[PDB]
């Protein structure tokens, strides 16, 4: 049995201001009696109502996920949330913890461009984004179609990896409809990050 406890997305924390964190338990045999998944906060204030979900899997494996809303002011102020999985089977209990990752912080730089139009792309054009030199690693990448935010499905972005010096970096590749670059020939790559200033947002525009 394995257990994972996520952080708020920067977007959920600094734009929507409705952050949540999810505690995910995996590798359960449905045979066993159900698992206890309780919460604790470092502050000792009580825990909001958490949402439980069970979903059996193609592995014969069973997934129980619990999502808890968290206070924005509470999280940034340096709060600690902790999830605890217990079972009548398991000997002791699993505990996973989350916090604002303290350390030095740098806001991200952003650049967007086009990949060279290439054979096999008559109606398809490809747009790219480079986001680098930020820390900590928590970042939210956004493509917007001229004052309209695009579905996150339309773009696929790489996992943050460490630079030679000290910053992080990610890549966002995006293919835009012929209609889309014709309806509006401007596309925006925006990053949300706690160092970014102001409103924790930096963005650029690039066209076909």
């Amino acid at each position, epitope marked *: 049995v394995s257990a994972y406890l996520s952080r708020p997305s920067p977007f959920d924390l600094f734009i929507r201001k409705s952050p949540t964190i999810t505690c995910l338990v995996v590798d359960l045999a449905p045979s066993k009696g159900t698992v206890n998944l*309780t919460w*604790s*906060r*470092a*502050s*000792g204030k009580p825990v909001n109502h958490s949402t439980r979900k069970e979903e059996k899997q193609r592995n014969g494996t069973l997934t129980v996920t619990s999502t808890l809303p968290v206070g924005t002011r509470d999280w940034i102020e*340096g709060e600690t949330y902790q999830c605890r999985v*217990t079972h009548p089977h398991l000997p*002791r209990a699993l*505990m996973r913890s989350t916090t604002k990752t303290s350390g030095p912080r740098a806001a991200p730089e952003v650049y967007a461009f086009a990949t060279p139009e290439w054979p096999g792309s008559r109606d398809k054009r490809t747009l790219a984004c480079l986001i680098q030199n930020f820390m900590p690693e928590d970042i939210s990448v956004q493509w917007l179609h001229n004052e309209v935010q695009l579905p996150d499905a339309r773009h696929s972005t790489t996992q943050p990896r460490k630079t030679k010096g000290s910053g992080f970096f990610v890549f966002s590749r995006l293919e835009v409809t012929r209609a889309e670059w014709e309806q509006k020939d401007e596309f925006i790559c925006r990053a949300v990050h706690e160092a970014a200033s102001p409103s924790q947002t930096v963005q650029r525009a690039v066209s076909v």
Partner: antibody
Amino acid sequence: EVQLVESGGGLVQPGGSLRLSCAVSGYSITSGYSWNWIRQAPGKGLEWVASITYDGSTNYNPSVKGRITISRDDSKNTFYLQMNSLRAEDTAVYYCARGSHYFGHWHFAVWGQGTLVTVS
Amino acid sequence: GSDIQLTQSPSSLSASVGDRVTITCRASQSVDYDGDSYMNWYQQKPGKAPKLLIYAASYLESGVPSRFSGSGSGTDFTLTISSLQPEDFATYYCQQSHEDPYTFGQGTKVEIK
């Protein structure tokens, strides 16, 4: 970032009383967490003395209940240790600390530099 | 005297940089409850206030060097410094948070040789 300062220590005569203050900055002591007093006799072990929660609950160490009081002052973001009838065994360094909460139990994650109390 | 008394060993020890140091805490009665053990480990360098290292027997406080590790259950707990370091020479305390009043062990001084 949650810094704690003891004050009000000093040399005091036996049978008298004194009051120590913990001047908390960077967090509202009514906003969350547990606020404690721990003292340490010169070259002796740590003894936990008293606690007060963000919601006003008190707890005392029975070895000093009845002659020790813990109180708080929201506006000055300060909390206090009231001690009457000082003895020699009260001679120690008094630390205040912010305890963090784990499924109904507290650990002492943030401390202050300490203030010394000397009797006789 | 119905409190939980924590006895540590050794009281004092000498080591060299790179050694493995192992410190032990023995409680008068079980500090187990609900699948966890409420034993915390602190480091105190001289003339400075303690620092929290491990809570709940085995969880490392944030920003704590990875070489520190805790283990144990029941009335037997262990702090392990896997590779001693020049700054780690200090007195080390265990404290139980299971039953009031909270109690501390008597401390173990790890001295540089």
